[PDB]
C-alpha cells in the first residue's frame, strides 16, 4: 500500500518519460482562404475545403 | 434428475413422490436425466404401492422437463419429472405397468421391458 522506501527523482523521471505531449506535426491550409486549420476541421473563420460552410 | 430432485413415479408399484439422493455413474456427475439410473429415497408413498417411505432403491428417469434432443434437432419436452423404480441389485422394474409417455432413448437393456409395458413410445 504505502512505499517502504522513498522513490528517487530518477524514478520519477523514468515514470514521466511517457508523459510527453505530441505535437500536431501538420496543419492543413485551405484553398479558398490560405489560413491554417486542423485537418478535417473548420478554419475558425468558417471554411472546410473550399466553401464557406458556417457563417459564424 | 439432480440431487435433491423430486420425481413422480410412472409405474404402479413405485409410489408417488420420490427424491434423488445420488446420481449414479460418474465421479462428480451433477445432472443426469435421460436414460440414467439414479439412487432414490421414497419421500411420500401410498400403501397400495409395494415400496414404503424412507426406502432407498434405484430408478431410471423416463420423463424430464429439460427434454431429450433428437438427432435432427427436435426437442421432446415432457412436463413433469418421472422415474421408474428399479431394484438396487437387479436394476429391474418393480412396477408391472408403466404409465404415461416414454422416449425411444430408453431402448437399451432392461429398459426394453419399460418401453414394452408403457403405452406411448
Amino acid at each position: 500500500a504505502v512505499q517502504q522506501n522513498k522513490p528517487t527523482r530518477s524514478k520519477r523521471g523514468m515514470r514521466r518519460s511517457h508523459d510527453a505531449l505530441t505535437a500536431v506535426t501538420s496543419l492543413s491550409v485551405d484553398k479558398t482562404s490560405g489560413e491554417k486549420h486542423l485537418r478535417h476541421h473548420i478554419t475558425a473563420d468558417g471554411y472546410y475545403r473550399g466553401r464557406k460552410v458556417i457563417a459564424k | 434428475i439432480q440431487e435433491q430432485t423430486m420425481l413422480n413415479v410412472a409405474d404402479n408399484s413405485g409410489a408417488r413422490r420420490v427424491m434423488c439422493i445420488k446420481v449414479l455413474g460418474g465421479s462428480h456427475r451433477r445432472y443426469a436425466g435421460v436414460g440414467d439410473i439414479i439412487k432414490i429415497t421414497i419421500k411420500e408413498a401410498i400403501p397400495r404401492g409395494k415400496v414404503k417411505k424412507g426406502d432407498v432403491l434405484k430408478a431410471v428417469v423416463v420423463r424430464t422437463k429439460k427434454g431429450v434432443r433428437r438427432p435432427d434437432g427436435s426437442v421432446i419436452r415432457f412436463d413433469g419429472n418421472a422415474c421408474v423404480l428399479l431394484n438396487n441389485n437387479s436394476e429391474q422394474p418393480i412396477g408391472t405397468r408403466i404409465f404415461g409417455p416414454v422416449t425411444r432413448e430408453l431402448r437399451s437393456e432392461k429398459f426394453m421391458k419399460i418401453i414394452s409395458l408403457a403405452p406411448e413410445v
Binding site: 486542423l38 478535417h40 476541421h41 473548420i42 475558425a44 472546410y48 460552410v53 458556417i54 457563417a55 | -
Partner: protein
C-alpha cells in the same frame, strides 16, 4: 463485450437518451444547423434522418408516428410541409456533420450537424 452492437450509451439511461434525441431532432429541424459534440451528432443522424424518410410520404398515420416520436407538432408540420419536398429526390444523407473546434469548458470533440440543402 460489445460485439456487433450499435447505439451509444453516452453515459445516461435510455429515457434520458430518448428525451435528448427528441429535443435534439426538434432543434435540428427548427434551426437546420446546430453545434453538438461529435458522438451525439453521429447518434443524431439515426434519429433525424428516419423522420425525413417518413416525411417523404404524407399521410395521417405518418404524421401521427412523427408526432409520437419527438412530440412537437411544429416539428411535424415542418417535416411534412417544408422538408420532404426538400429531400424527396435525395436518397439519404439529409444531415451532414462538420467537425469543429474543441469546447472550452471541457475538451470535447465538437461538430456542426446541418441539413444538406440549407439556403445559407
Amino acid at each position: 463485450m460489445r460485439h456487433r452492437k450499435s447505439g451509444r450509451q453516452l453515459n445516461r439511461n435510455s429515457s434520458h437518451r430518448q428525451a435528448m434525441f427528441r429535443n435534439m431532432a426538434g432543434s435540428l429541424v427548427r434551426h437546420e444547423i446546430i453545434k453538438t459534440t461529435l458522438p451525439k451528432a453521429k447518434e443524431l443522424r439515426r434519429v433525424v434522418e428516419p423522420l425525413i424518410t417518413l416525411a417523404k410520404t404524407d399521410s395521417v398515420a405518418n404524421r401521427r408516428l412523427a408526432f409520437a416520436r419527438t412530440r412537437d407538432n411544429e416539428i411535424v408540420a415542418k417535416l411534412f410541409n417544408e422538408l420532404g419536398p426538400r429531400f424527396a429526390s435525395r436518397a439519404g444523407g439529409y444531415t451532414r456533420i462538420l467537425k469543429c473546434g474543441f469546447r472550452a469548458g471541457d475538451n470535447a470533440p465538437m461538430a456542426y450537424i446541418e441539413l444538406v440543402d440549407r439556403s445559407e
